[PDB]
Design a protein around this ligand. Structure first.
Ligand code: HEM
Ligand SMILES: *[C@@H]1O[C@H](CO)[C@@H](O)[C@H](O)[C@H]1NC(C)=O
Length: 195
């Protein structure tokens, strides 16, 4: 399970899943219903060892038929891509999601971070069908421990199969916050990673 986690780099709090084998983290912030009504978006965080190749998720758990987001750092430059697989095969580029890389992204030489806004990312056809407003969500996580996408300058780069991947359940309502807009602004305005 993920827990509420203070991001010391930015002062914001995420619902964070820390994976012990990879030493990577997957953080999410979702908008509320009390304030900031339209919830067709969330903020994500991919964080891991600076030497890792790429870090990704599945928004419906299964690799199959759910938005797959994949982030990496090309030198010092963060990248992010939305993808879609109909089986256990190299995913294709998925249009639908609107992705914005936010501040505190890049590398300090110890960690890499990709902090992102994902709009139009909570409803889709197939798989889980979307991220529920309330109740349980199952997310996937995926990680390549060593090797960057083949052409790391291109957000549509081909990539090698993850060295590690699995799934976990979490309470979506616990990841929702009326602080969402404040958090979004704060993260957008954070400078890039440098240490
Ligand atoms: C060359 C590309 C890829 C291939 C051939 C591939 C293949 C597979 C295979 C065979 C599994 C079954 C479990 C395992 O053996 O690890 C799996 C699981 C998974 N993959 Fe991929 N994968 C690829 C890329 C991706 C990407 C880019 C993501 C998302 C960023 C992703 C997300 C997952 C997740 C979450 C699981 C675990 C849940 C499930 O079993 O469906 N994969 N993948
Ligand atoms: C949002 O995503 C869906 C795919 O899940 C797509 O059909 C639609 O065109 C996208 N909408 C916008 C407004 O970009």
């Amino acid at each position: 399970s993920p827990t509420q986690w203070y991001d010391s780099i930015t002062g914001v709090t995420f619902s964070r899943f820390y994976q012990q084998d990879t030493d990577a983290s997957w953080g999410y912030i979702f908008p509320s219903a009390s304030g900031g009504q339209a919830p067709d978006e969330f903020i994500g965080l991919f964080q891991g060892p600076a030497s890792a190749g790429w870090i990704g998720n599945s928004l419906g758990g299964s690799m199959r038929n759910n938005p797959l987001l994949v982030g990496w750092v090309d030198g010092s430059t963060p990248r992010i891509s939305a993808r879609w697989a109909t089986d256990y095969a190299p995913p294709s580029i998925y249009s639908g999601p609107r992705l914005t890389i936010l501040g505190s992204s890049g590398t300090n030489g110890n960690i890499q971070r990709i902090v992102y806004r994902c709009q139009n990312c909570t409803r889709w056809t197939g798989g889980a069908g979307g991220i529920p407003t309330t109740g349980s969500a199952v997310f996937g996580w995926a990680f390549h421990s060593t090797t960057k996408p083949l052409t790391p300058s291109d957000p549509s780069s081909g990539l090698y199969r993850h060295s590690h991947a699995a799934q976990y359940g979490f309470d979506i309502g616990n990841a929702r916050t009326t602080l969402y807009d404040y958090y979004l602004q704060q993260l957008t305005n954070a400078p890039p990673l440098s240490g």
